[PDB]
Amino acid sequence: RGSHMLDPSELPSALIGKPFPAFDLPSVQDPARRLTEADLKGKPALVNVWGTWCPSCRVEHPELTRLAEQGVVIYGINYKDDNAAAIKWLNELHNPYLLSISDADGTLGLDLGVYGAPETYLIDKQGIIRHKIVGVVDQKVWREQLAPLYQQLLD
Template identity: 55%
Template sequence: MGRFKLFLPLIALVVLLPLFYVGLKLDPTAMPSALVGNSVPEYSLSLVSNEQQSASNEDLKGQVTLLNVWATWCFACKAEHPYLNKLSQQGVNIVGVNYKDDRNAAKKWLRELHDPYLYSLYDNEGRLGLELGVTGAPETYLIDSEGVVRYRHIGVVDERVWSQILKPLYEQFTATASN
């Protein structure tokens, strides 16, 4: 029994090495979404710009859209915002979801930093965010012309993310919608 105790660390290492190996190959930023392949959850929310106007999930149908979750309290959102403005100027359809934020602060943000959104939903209670599975801002969802979530990106959308991931998908679903 005494010799067996000497081999316990070796046995533990042999058991754990394959787990460590697999863990090193996993992408820590990849978080699967149960929504991918399903319709955007039903909602009806007022707009940041006008609390008397609202939009619903039905408004996402008919065109491929990036649904971008943002907030004024989010530092990464501020870093992402200029690139979203650039995409908007190139004709990319972007709808904002202002997440757990102050409406006046959001209005000021869009006025000062320019507004890349077709419109921005005001999700002050975070209910839409909860149904989307938002873990934090920014998050961006690629929505096809039928209102189905096709991709979820957690983090900042920048040149690399757009050109390598989102643009090919955006163009693929836009081409499919045209046919």
């Protein structure tokens, strides 16, 4: 395999200081209920990109719950997934997400620079992106890579 370069939008630094991309998408649990980027505003928060196709996302789930238990607001982007399967996941396991955005065609992921899962965006209360983690967030990642910035956004 020859070299393959990710495009600039997929770099963790790409959307730093930029507003969360605009979108109008159905919620996972109710397709008649519509969500937009305005629903992400108000509190500093994580935006976690996940899919039922994603074994790493299954593994990350207990950590996301652990953060939610400590009052961390987490919104979920269900990316290019089976909706029925996604609803099951949100039922069978312990939903840490305050909102579950159905991004079935990946157009929101497209604007975010998403190229798999899990990926986690830290946003401020204005919905401006402040950090991006590619791959599983564990205690260590949270403690070192997110926690310090998240604390600043609360203050």
